[PDB]
Amino acid sequence: MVSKGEELFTGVVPILVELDGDVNGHKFSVSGEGEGDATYGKLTLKLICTTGKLPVPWPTLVTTLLQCFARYPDHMKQHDFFKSAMPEGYVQERTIFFKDDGNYKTRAEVKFEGDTLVNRIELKGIDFKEDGNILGHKLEYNYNSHNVYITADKQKNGIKANFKIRHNIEDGGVQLADHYQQNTPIGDGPVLLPDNHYLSYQSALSKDPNEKRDHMVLLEFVTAAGIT
Amino acid sequence: MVSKGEELFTGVVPILVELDGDVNGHKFSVSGEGEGDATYGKLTLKLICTTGKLPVPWPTLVTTLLQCFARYPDHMKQHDFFKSAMPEGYVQERTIFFKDDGNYKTRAEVKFEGDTLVNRIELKGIDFKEDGNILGHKLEYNYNSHNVYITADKQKNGIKANFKIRHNIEDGGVQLADHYQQNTPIGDGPVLLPDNHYLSYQSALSKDPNEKRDHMVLLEFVTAAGIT
């Protein structure tokens, strides 16, 4: 239960991320490593496109490329589904609707493989406008804070989430991305089904000045809230 | 010039921050320490209210509590006024208009005192609504990304900046804060007067789980841009 999940994330945990995607026909792959410290609701990753140049803005992949590292306050630990599902893990599926543009559909499996927390993903994007903010690469290289609204999904012994990302556009404006999320345990064991709450996210995108490959250094701070 | 400023910020630099403020009559003081690495346009600070509980939301003080740590690309280094003014330093004055509420007026001096970069500030806030988002503490504990638009101010041998902060409000909405900035060198030496550009900011607010005092752990990533 609480102690079981808390134990698996007691200190700093190594992370591995793998993604294969296809957006409007452009195939690409991303691989990344890093670590997370749920004690501080912190996570840091260096993600690299191993197929060359990324066909879409890096910011559009931030949400796809580890909610188990969220910092749940003591009074809210009974609501931490993500950690309660470990190490077996859970599948995280999403559909992302980019306002007035295409959409991504993703499926990921996150769980431990030894001492390492792994996130393997498959992404498919369709109907993007060649001249849009996505394929046109018109999004600024940055990120804002958002809240991930969560509710239990007892039918699937998991949870559902919904939130809208605001991607700042170069020279002004915002490109919204509506996220519909579903998380289902991989195992058949018992999990912590939560009462409604949300995860408060804050992220910063950076670059490794010495790296030649197309990449993204991502930093996230996550804290659960919404319950007194 | 460029090399002179680059030299002072070559590695990791210790930082000291001090602030005395008065908002609608509530007097308070903040003291903080940390470090910055302009090579990665990064900065981290732990800021503490030494007078007890902070009378205003911590997020409202983020912009007041080190633009010299910005990461300027090679082709833009001749435009880095902040570093060119060091170690003597510069005065940074601002007027912050919180939409439909009060305003802050600040004056700060930032420069080196030995190997440490210091930021001492005086803040005065007026006409805040007792029931507003500020004195009512209705702002979420987080931060978004913004661009700091800069232009040279040859009359004062310094620069001027303008930007609008978006403070997310608890349960929805945004509380805007219009920033009008002026930076003037403390010394009378020559500085780097820049062509128009902006600093791309990204910030994350956190907490030291072991600290008893009212405080804020602030992280900022800053990179200059707007010039080809």
Written as one string, the DSSP assignment of A164-205 is: EEEEEBTTS-EEEEEEEEEEEESS-S---PPPSEEEEEEEEE
- Identify the residue among A140, A145, A228 best suited for mutation to test binding to B, counting B beta carbons within 10 A and taking the highest: A145
- HEC-encoded secondary structure of chain B: CHHHHHHHCCCCEEEEEEEEEEECCEEEEEEEEEEEEHHHCEEEEEEEECCCCCCCCHHHHCCCCCHHHCECCHHHHHHCHHHHCCCCCEEEEEEEEECCCCEEEEEEEEEEECCEEEEEEEEEEECCCCCCCCCCCCECCCCCCEEEEEEEEHHHCEEEEEEEEEEEECCCCEEEEEEEEEEEECCCCCCCCCCCEEEEEEEEEECCCCCCCCEEEEEEEEEEECCC
* Spatial CB neighbours of A15, under 8 Å, sequence gap ≥ 6: A32, A33, A34, A35, A36, A43, A45, A66, A116, A117, A118, A119
How close, in Å, is residue A78 to chain B by CA atoms?
19
* Residue A75, φ and ψ in degrees, nearest 5: -70, -5
Contact residues, chain A to chain B, C-beta under 8 Å: 39-42, 140-145, 147, 168, 200, 202-206, 209, 219, 221
* Spatial CB neighbours of A22, under 8 Å, sequence gap ≥ 6: A28, A123, A124, A125
Q: Within a 13 Å sphere around the CA of B47, how many CA atoms are in the beta-carbon half? A: 27
Are the C-beta atoms of A39 and A147 separated by less than 8 Å? no
Q: Are strands A197-206 and A174-185 parallel, antiparallel or unpaired?
A: unpaired
The CA distances from residue A196 to A81, A90, A148, in Å, are: 12, 19, 11
How big is chain B by its Cα radius of gyration, in Å?
Answer: 17
Residues β-bridged to residue A45: A34, A218
How big is chain A by its Cα radius of gyration, in Å?
Answer: 17
Count CB atoms within 10 A of the CB of residue B112. Answer: 16
How close, in Å, is residue B188 to chain A by CA atoms?
34
Write out chain B residues lying below 8 Å of A205, CB-based.
202, 221
Nearest to B221 by CA among B199, B198, B195, B192: B199
Closest residue to A209, CB basis, from B39, B142, B221:
B39
Closest residue to B202, CB basis, from A42, A204, A209:
A204
- Identify the residue among B39, B198, B202 best suited for mutation to test binding to A, counting A beta carbons within 10 A and taking the highest: B202
Asked whether the bond before A87 is cis by omega within 30 degrees of 0, the reply is yes
Q: Give the whole-angstrom CA distance, residue B125 versus residue B22.
A: 6
B72: nearest CA partner in chain A: A209
CATH number assigned to the domain comprising residue B220: 2.40.155.10
B166: nearest CA partner in chain A: A144
Host domain of residue B191: 1-228
Nearest to B228 by CA among B75, B112, B91, B95: B75
* Residue B132, φ and ψ in degrees, nearest 5: -70, 180
Structure tokens at A221: 């701070």
How close, in Å, is residue A176 to chain B by CA atoms?
15
Closest residue to B40, CB basis, from A140, A202, A209:
A209
Structure tokens at A211: 């790296």
For chain B, the distance separating the N- and C-terminal CA atoms, rounded to the nearest angstrom, is 21
CB contact under 8 A, B209 and A39: yes
Amino acid B75 reads H
Write out chain B residues lying below 8 Å of A148, CB-based.
none
Residues β-bridged to residue B51: none
B222: nearest CA partner in chain A: A206
Q: Give the whole-angstrom CA distance, residue A49 versus residue A116.
A: 21
Q: Are strands A174-185 and A90-98 parallel, antiparallel or unpaired?
A: antiparallel
B207: nearest CA partner in chain A: A40
How close, in Å, is residue A192 to chain B by CA atoms?
24
* Residue A128, φ and ψ in degrees, nearest 5: -80, 145
Q: Give the whole-angstrom CA distance, residue A203 versus residue A181.
A: 19
DSSP chain A: -HHHHHHHTSS-EEEEEEEEEEETTEEEEEEEEEEEEGGGTEEEEEEEETTSS-SS-GGGGTTT--GGG-B--GGGGGG-HHHHTTTT-EEEEEEEEETTS-EEEEEEEEEEETTEEEEEEEEEEES--TTSTTTTT-B-S----EEEEEEEEGGGTEEEEEEEEEEEBTTS-EEEEEEEEEEEESS-S---PPPSEEEEEEEEEE--TT--SSEEEEEEEEEEES--
Nearest to A177 by CA among A212, A133, A228: A133
* Spatial CB neighbours of B188, under 8 Å, sequence gap ≥ 6: none
- Tally the domains of chain B: 1
- Residues of B186-196 as b/e, b for ≥16 C-beta within 10 angstroms? eeeeebbbbee
Method: X-ray
Closest residue to A168, CB basis, from B41, B145, B205:
B145
Write out chain A residues lying below 8 Å of B200, CB-based.
140-142
Write out chain B residues lying below 8 Å of A164, CB-based.
none
* Spatial CB neighbours of B171, under 8 Å, sequence gap ≥ 6: none
CB contact under 8 A, A143 and B145: yes
Write out chain B residues lying below 8 Å of A142, CB-based.
145, 200, 202
- Identify the residue among B144, B217, B223 best suited for mutation to test binding to A, counting A beta carbons within 10 A and taking the highest: B144
